[PDB]
Design a protein around this nucleic acid. Structure first.
Length: 156
DNA sequence: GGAAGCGAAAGTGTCGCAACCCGAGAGAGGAACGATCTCGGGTTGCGACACTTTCGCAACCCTTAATACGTTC
């Protein structure tokens, strides 16, 4: 069963238990408000411990392509490298993205899978439903089709 | 995404005011009958404004978080 089999192998848990856990998994988030530095609050949704472990095992199991221009969440690279890339230069064009993490839906993730220029792990159609449960957060309880990436999750 | 309150924005009805019309009437002149100006309703058009509808700001944070110290998203 591909993905669930690998997750069971890594997490030392039965396939049936992991499959049963990944049914209401997108709802398994605890959301809290962290203070902003000047004023206001920031809403962060953090998954439960079991879902966190599942996400960590999944991201360790499957390696997705990343670019060398990305300096965030990369091993050995951080703030200093990002700043030093433009240390010797004169003009700059700092830009931002509009609600970046919450704008990544399962449709976007699956679309980017199929048109990638680099190697992409092969996903069976049976596990494509489980991938969405593993990765994405479901912020409204009544709406089940609204799935977005949540900052504060290990896989995001 | 969107409680509960509330207010913006836009559309629609309404209602009072002005403007005019039309019949009644006392009676100017000058020798009678009724000119002419006013009283009392009545109708219509119009525009300011009240009323009506829709939208949008943004509580809470869901059962489900972790808690050596600092930046960053």
């Amino acid at each position: 069963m591909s993905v669930i089999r690998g997750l069971a192998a890594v997490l030392r848990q039965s396939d049936s238990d992991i499959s049963a856990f990944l049914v209401t998994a997108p709802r398994k988030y605890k959301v809290y408000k962290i203070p902003k530095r000047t004023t206001g609050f920031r809403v962060i949704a953090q998954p439960a411990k079991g879902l966190k472990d599942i996400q960590r095992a999944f991201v360790q199991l499957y390696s997705l392509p990343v670019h060398d221009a990305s300096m965030a969440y990369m091993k050995g690279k951080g703030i200093r490298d990002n700043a030093a890339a433009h240390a010797g230069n004169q003009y700059l064009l700092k830009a931002d993205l509009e609600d970046f993490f919450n704008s990544i839906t399962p449709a976007i993730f699956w679309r980017c899978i199929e048109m990638s220029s680099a190697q992409t792990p092969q996903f069976e159609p049976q596990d494509k439903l489980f991938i969405e449960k593993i990765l994405f957060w479901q912020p409204i309880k009544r709406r089940k089709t609204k799935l977005i990436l949540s900052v504060g999750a290990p896989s995001s």
